[PDB]
Amino acid sequence: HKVLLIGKMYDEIGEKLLAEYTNVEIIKEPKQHQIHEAIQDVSGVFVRYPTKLDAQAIGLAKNLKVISTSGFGTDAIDIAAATKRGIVVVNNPGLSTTAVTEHTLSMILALAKKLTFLNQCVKAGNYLIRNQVQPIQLEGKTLGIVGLGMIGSAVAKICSTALQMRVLAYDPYVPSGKADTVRATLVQDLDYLLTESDFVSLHPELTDETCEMFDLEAFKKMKPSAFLINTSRGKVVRQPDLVTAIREKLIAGAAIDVFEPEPPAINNPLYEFDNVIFSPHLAGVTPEAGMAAALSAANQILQVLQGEKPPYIINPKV
Amino acid sequence: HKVLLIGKMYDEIGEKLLAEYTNVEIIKEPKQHQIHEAIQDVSGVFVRYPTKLDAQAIGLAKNLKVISTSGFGTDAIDIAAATKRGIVVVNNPGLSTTAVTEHTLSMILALAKKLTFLNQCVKAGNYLIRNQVQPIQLEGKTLGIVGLGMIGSAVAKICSTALQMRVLAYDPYVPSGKADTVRATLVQDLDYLLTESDFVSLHPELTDETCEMFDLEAFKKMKPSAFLINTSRGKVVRQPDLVTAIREKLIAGAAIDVFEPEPPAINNPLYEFDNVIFSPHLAGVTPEAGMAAALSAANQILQVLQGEKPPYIINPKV
Numbered sequence: 001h002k003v004l005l006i007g008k009m010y011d012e013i014g015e016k017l018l019a020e021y022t023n024v025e026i027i028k029e030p031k032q033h034q035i036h037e038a039i040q041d042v043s044g045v046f047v048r049y050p051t052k053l054d055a056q057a058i059g060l061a062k063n064l065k066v067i068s069t070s071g072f073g074t075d076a077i078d079i080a081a082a083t084k085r086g087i088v089v090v091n092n093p094g095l096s097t098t099a100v101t102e103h104t105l106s107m108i109l110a111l112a113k114k115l116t117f118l119n120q121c122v123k124a125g126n127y128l129i130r131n132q133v134q135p136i137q138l139e140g141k142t143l144g145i146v147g148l149g150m151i152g153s154a155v156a157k158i159c160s161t162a163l164q165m166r167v168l169a170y171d172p173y174v175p176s177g178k179a180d181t182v183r184a185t186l187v188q189d190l191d192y193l194l195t196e197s198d199f200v201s202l203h204p205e206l207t208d209e210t211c212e213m214f215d216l217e218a219f220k221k222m223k224p225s226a227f228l229i230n231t232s233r234g235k236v237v238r239q240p241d242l243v244t245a246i247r248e249k250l251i252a253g254a255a256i257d258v259f260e261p262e263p264p265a266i267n268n269p270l271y272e273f274d275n276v277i278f279s280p281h282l283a284g285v286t287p288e289a290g291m292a293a294a295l296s297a298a299n300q301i302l303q304v305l306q307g308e309k310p311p312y313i314i315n316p317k318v
Numbered sequence: 319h320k321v322l323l324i325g326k327m328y329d330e331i332g333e334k335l336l337a338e339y340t341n342v343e344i345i346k347e348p349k350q351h352q353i354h355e356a357i358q359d360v361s362g363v364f365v366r367y368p369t370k371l372d373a374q375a376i377g378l379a380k381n382l383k384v385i386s387t388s389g390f391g392t393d394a395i396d397i398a399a400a401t402k403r404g405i406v407v408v409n410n411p412g413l414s415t416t417a418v419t420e421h422t423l424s425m426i427l428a429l430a431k432k433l434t435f436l437n438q439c440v441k442a443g444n445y446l447i448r449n450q451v452q453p454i455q456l457e458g459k460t461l462g463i464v465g466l467g468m469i470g471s472a473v474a475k476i477c478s479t480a481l482q483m484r485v486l487a488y489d490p491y492v493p494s495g496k497a498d499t500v501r502a503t504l505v506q507d508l509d510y511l512l513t514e515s516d517f518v519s520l521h522p523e524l525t526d527e528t529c530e531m532f533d534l535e536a537f538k539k540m541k542p543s544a545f546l547i548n549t550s551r552g553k554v555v556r557q558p559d560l561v562t563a564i565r566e567k568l569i570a571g572a573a574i575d576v577f578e579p580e581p582p583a584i585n586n587p588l589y590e591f592d593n594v595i596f597s598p599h600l601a602g603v604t605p606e607a608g609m610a611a612a613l614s615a616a617n618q619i620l621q622v623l624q625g626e627k628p629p630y631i632i633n634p635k636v
């Protein structure tokens with residue numbers, strides 16, 4: 001039994017847990033030829049987001065029986081080619097709730113306190129910028145949350161109680177008591193959340209309903225002084241509409257951690273604007289969260305290699 | 319009765335409150351000659367931090383009876399020259415507690431989530447930096463707070479309960495129950511706080527005891543992975559020792575909002591380091607906080623012009 005690690009895990013504990021039971025090779029940022037040679041006899045595959053497992057590589061893997069992503073996203077795996085051969089594709093979701101909550105708070109406060117802008121002014125000797133701009137006090141301001149899931153609830157709870165913000169939440173599949181629990185108000189009309197909020201943070205599941213649900217019409221309804229925070233999925237925002245919204249000052253700025261596509265091109269049009277700050281899809285990649293997903297990825301590989309049904313099968317039809 | 323506004327107030331409501339009762343002139347970023355001409359017959363003076371009121375300008379003001387700073391700092395007023403002439407110098411402290419608390423949280427999270435560093439990597443097309451660095455999960459980490467005053471307590475309360483951090487506090491003039499109230503542990507040995515903390519935030523009163531109390535010896539005791547946050551006063555940190563500490567990687571980085579001296583020179587040696595982020599003394603200058611200090615400054619000017627003792631006299635001997 002051999003296992004191939006396409007990319008390091010977010011923590012080396014999952015790799016030692018696999019080395020104790022199988023023969024493991026690790027390849028960091030490989031070319032396609034390195035994948036083709038190292039996957040022939042391999043029995044389990046781990047894929048580090050967002051590198052891609054294609055139908056050719058899956059076709060060359062003769063003994064392959066289980067594939068594990070590093071986290072929730074499977075948009076880089078050819079699941080169809082893997083189902084045809086009956087290969088188990090496994091996920092690792094929901095191990096980074098606390099990491100993304102902290103990251104959303106960091107970016108909300110960064111936009112409000114004008115962190116990156118004020119930093120360059122002082123480094124460039126423009127201390128006198130404190131006569132033209134001012135930071136935003138969060139207390140009393142309205143935070144609008146799309147998606148009152150695990151992460152959206154946690155962000156709502158902190159901003160309402162610790163930051164004394166007014167929290168509105170939009171989620172068609174949630175009882176209003178869930179909003180009441182975290183001291184938020186559930187709002188059905190998304191226009192109301194858009195027109196009321198000084199800060200809009202996205203935490204919904206990526207579905208056909210939420211795919212590109214934040215487009216130019218939504219940005220137009222938002223306050224020109226409002227900010228957008230996106231730590232969910234890149235496909236929730238129609239990227240060109242976010243460019244127009246920023247360029248035409250339809251919103252005051254944004255902070256995004258997820259992209260479409262991933263990885264983003266080096267010439268992304270959003271990089272130009274200073275009121276838009278980025279992080280390379282790391283809101284859920286803290287050491288504590290990376291250690292959980294790495295262990296979870298190691299278990300599910302071993303469980304399939306031993307004929308046990310792992311908890312997060314993407315294609316249960318095999 | 320005329321009043322001179324050396325610099326705009328942090329909000330124009332205090333200026334209208336003075337315009338209703340006196341003749342007001344406002345000068346923005348003046349030369350010394352503009353001050354000399356506009357202060358001769360003036361009866362009240364407002365000074366916007368950190369511009370300086372010198373003994374010459376005070377000497378030329380014949381009808382001057384009250385001086386008000388914009389906030390707490392009076393290190394830019396020649397209080398001695400004003401006391402000689404019996405002029406009331408007035409302060410405006412403690413109106414920005416919530417503003418600085420939010421600002422400290424923003425900077426703590428910014429250092430932990432590596433905000434500014436990860437932002438330039440993505441803008442420079444280095445999305446793959448997520449393979450070399452990782453953000454820090456605050457949960458379980460130790461926050462060390464120097465000065466359990468109004469702001470230090472508020473920061474401690476949020477980081478302990480909302481962020482699930484371990485909070486240690488150093489303050490010789492505070493009962494341990496005050497730390498227990500905000501779910502922190504009061505620590506007498508400052509070495510213990512230095513050696514234990516992953517994040518050190520400064521909120522003490524600037525005294526002879528706290529003047530330059532954070533020097534090279536203190537940085538050496540700190541963890542090389544720890545971060546420094548300074549929203550108190552610039553004189554609490556011995557600036558050259560912070561340069562050596564950063565350059566020699568004695569600490570992982572810093573986030574400072576206050577300087578010594580203020581304003582800082584355009585060629586400050588700290589501007590060079592990327593793990594050091596700045597804001598131009600704005601932690602207490604939110605609109606809500608700026609509106610309070612502006613009203614407070616307007617009242618104390620009018621109260622002296624009407625023979626009423628204002629609450630924040632710097633030189634009560636007049």
Ligand SMILES: NC(=O)c1ccc[n+]([C@@H]2O[C@H](COP(=O)([O-])OP(=O)(O)OC[C@H]3O[C@@H](n4cnc5c(N)ncnc54)[C@H](O)[C@@H]3O)[C@@H](O)[C@H]2O)c1
Nearest residue numbers: 147148149150151170171173203204205209231232283284
């Ligand atoms: N940036 C990262 O590294 C990272 C890490 C983990 C998760 N995420 C993403 O964060 C997002 C939120 O995470 P989660 O664990 O809390 O998801 P979740 O499953 O706990 O809940 C998401 C919520 O979305 C809601 N929702 C569904 N459709 C909606 C719609 N049309 N409008 C409004 N709300 C809708 C659902 O009711 C659900 O409550 C997910 O998209 C997840 O992929 C990102």
Ligand SMILES: NC(=O)c1ccc[n+]([C@@H]2O[C@H](COP(=O)([O-])OP(=O)(O)OC[C@H]3O[C@@H](n4cnc5c(N)ncnc54)[C@H](O)[C@@H]3O)[C@@H](O)[C@H]2O)c1
Nearest residue numbers: 465466467468469488489491521522523527549550601602
């Ligand atoms: N950046 C800004 O714009 C801004 C705005 C307001 C206040 N501040 C500064 O923030 C700092 C804290 O504000 P505050 O209102 O909470 O002050 P505070 O008066 O409420 O309390 C400060 C604490 O310092 C403690 N202290 C005194 N000596 C100490 C020592 N040797 N060691 C440890 N602790 C000691 C005191 O016991 C007191 O509890 C002050 O220096 C203030 O000037 C900055």
